[PDB]
Amino acid sequence: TTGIATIEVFLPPRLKKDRKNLLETRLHITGRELRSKIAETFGLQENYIKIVINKKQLQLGKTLEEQGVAHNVKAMVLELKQSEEDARKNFQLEE
Amino acid sequence: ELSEEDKQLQDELEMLVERLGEKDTSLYRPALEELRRQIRSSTTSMTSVPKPLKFLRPHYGKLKEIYENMAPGENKRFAADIISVLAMTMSGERECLKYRLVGSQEELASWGHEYVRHLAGEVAKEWQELDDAEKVQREPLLTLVKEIVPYNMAHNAEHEACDLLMEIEQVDMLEKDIDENAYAKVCLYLTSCVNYVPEPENSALLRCALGVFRKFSRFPEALRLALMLNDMELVEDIFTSCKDVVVQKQMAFMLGRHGVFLELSEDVEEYEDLTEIMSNVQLNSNFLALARELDIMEPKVPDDIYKTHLENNRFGGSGSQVDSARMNLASSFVNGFVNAAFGQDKLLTDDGNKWLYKNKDHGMLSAAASLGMILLWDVDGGLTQIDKYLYSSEDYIKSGALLACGIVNSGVRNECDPALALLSDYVLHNSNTMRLGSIFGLGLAYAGSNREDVLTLLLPVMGDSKSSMEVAGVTALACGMIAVGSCNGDVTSTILQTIMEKSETELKDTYARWLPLGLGLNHLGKGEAIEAILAALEVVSEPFRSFANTLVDVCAYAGSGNVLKVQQLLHICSEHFADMGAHQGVAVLGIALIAMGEEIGAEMALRTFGHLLRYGEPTLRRAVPLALALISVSNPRLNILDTLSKFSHDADPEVSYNSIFAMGMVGSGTNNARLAAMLRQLAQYHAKDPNNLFMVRLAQGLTHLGKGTLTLCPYHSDRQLMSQVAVAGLLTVLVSFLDVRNIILGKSHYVLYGLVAAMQPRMLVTFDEELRPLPVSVRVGQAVDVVGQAGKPKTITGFQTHTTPVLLAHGERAELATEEFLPVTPILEGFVILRKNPNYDL
Description:
The structure is cut from a larger assembly and holds chains A (95 residues) and B (842 residues). Chain A has 95 residues and is an alpha+beta fold. Chain A is 23% helix and 28% strand. The longest helix of chain A is centred in the middle third of the chain and has 12 residues, at 31-42. Chain B is mainly α and 842 residues long. In chain B, strand 2 and strand 3 (721-722) form a beta hairpin. Chain B is elongated, with a radius of gyration of 32 Å. Chain B starts with a helix and ends in a 6-residue tail after the last strand. The chains are: A alpha+beta (95), B mainly alpha (842). The interface between A and B is medium-sized, with 29 and 26 residues. Chain A: This is NEDD8 ultimate buster 1. Chain A: Specific down-regulator of the NEDD8 conjugation system. Recruits NEDD8, UBD, and their conjugates to the proteasome for degradation. Isoform 1 promotes the degradation of NEDD8 more efficiently than isoform 2. Chain A: It comes from Homo sapiens (Human).
């Protein structure tokens, strides 16, 4: 209804909370807004989390509607030992 | 000689039979009445010798002709009864049958148990002697059965009833005739007889037992027989029919153990709990509890596993300071497999990059896969560590990380499906290594899924001419093991088109052996639909035509026990003529996989393999150890280990390699100290050859898998329940191992990780109705049936008292020593739920 989705966000078992949660979100926002809103909702670092949607990898530069997100779509939340860009630089430096 | 009573009775019988000479009116009624009375009195008694039958040795020819001419009414029927009883002792099979057939009906119960059994045997003989040329004789025999079966049911003679009903090929009456106190006996009889009866009667018997169990509402057993039949519609029917939520949870546990994931509609209450149980997300946690019960949290290191402190250091401080790549790969496999599924390692978790940096190309892939394989059944926990190594500098090892994902998602499923999302953008990668890693991770993560979306996504890879041969082979095996035992027409047609368009020069490579694999992996346990498959494969030319035909023949009859197929395979093996011996090797593996269905067939396959070894040509000698490994996976039988130890010193390198892998597979996870000592001795003896050392260290890792708490058995439910995913995994590993140097010792170490697809644990974790762990005293011992067909659960002896969770070695079962709890599933395997006993009073 009213152009919103009740996304089923699945937190990792390490964070002792509910395994599956319901988040009331919109669809015109982008993947960066998506990860930021999960981080603020469930108390995580935005740069230390990876979000998995609708059996596809999140396109942070592309909005939710154009990457396939819809109503009642699951959202895996994966903790990062090192931030995405930080891990990229850290590992790619060692050669 | 006779006695006074015997002589008088003989004289009376002779007088009665001699009075029938003429046609006097007061002869046929009196004489036949007297004969009927005496015969009924003697037969309807104890098993004492039927004295009238012993005395009576006349000829019925005059009796038969007079039967023909006298009294078209009941007197000829009396004569028929008398001659039938007489000929039951003699050999008058057809005549003795038709006397009861057309003579006085009365009832078979009025004669005796032995008469009923003899009539049943004669009826079976006639039915086997009667073809479809005429059904006139079938109906009265069916009417005879209508009364024979209830007699056996009421007189505990279910043996003869079941046998007769199998001879007539009709088993419907068991649905309406089985009682409450006898359903277990007949059900066990059928579930034991199904293995040895050939096609197609086994499937009919299985569905008959399924219907019986549904009628008596033994739902877990119905699920077991449904997975035996391997048909989803009846599984769904049983799932709908399950009105007890505890039985629903139990059947979810067994479905997760078998790896069958059926979509559940929202109409069923407690859908989320059943779905999460079937996804098997809890298992790892329980495993952790398992480990913390045994104080085996601390992971091991390859140095202590090899026990270098005991090996004779003939060269000290000068010959061990060089770290070759291959020994590093072996140490990776060890410091993986040994410490796998414990959630921690002391060398790959705190010193990851430093370890991986001393590996080259293939070592990168192997170590990246082992990083995920050091933590099993923790999708989020595994990926939290796998992501950084996915972000590695050497992006070529990215594919390895995907294997880690595919090896972490193995045995579990998530709603968000991290594996599908992670590999959807990487399957189409143009790099051969990238696509290889993507497809392998997707296959390992989705073993037995049969999901149409993943299959459709995997379809374009086969038609891609750019895709390399090893990419095509891995794609075919992944497609086959995602669609295990389904005969998917889409995958079958795709693989058939791919092999048809393939050229002979490109087919000559080893990886082309993986093209039938997936095709065969599509047809596990279903030999009926393979006539069309062999007809289609006949188009391609020999020798690969015969190779593919043999491989699909193996895959069709996986555990079937069809001795005719084994005879064809043995004929293939015995034909003494490189690629020509591949047919014989595949046929040897075929004898193995067909015979592993039955314990008797397997143990005779042992003797056949011994004869093949001591009297076969080099290719057969190389092939046999793989077959021996297939026969007794995670079953450290000492005779098998002794033969493999004898042949580990053979002058043929391939034979020794296969024997070492057979040690690794057969003794996998048993933590056999004798096997560990023999493997250490083999490592000491083979200290020079890198390949022998690598494979012996791999065998040590396999035998120390999970510190002795992991098994690769493709069998469950008292070894009666086959596992399609596990069978597929061992099949891929073994057929790849048919060429150890090019595949295993070449560029394809990752194929070994297919065994993790078969990686299944053993515990005795006991849950309450709410799924909390519950410690229950358990009597554990060997399941050696001290009875015959009494229906007993093998009457577990060799008792030992344990507190759950417990570790059960292969071939040793468990039972509940406490009456305080009742298990929903009487087969105490894996995770079980115990209902508190309402009958027990304090």
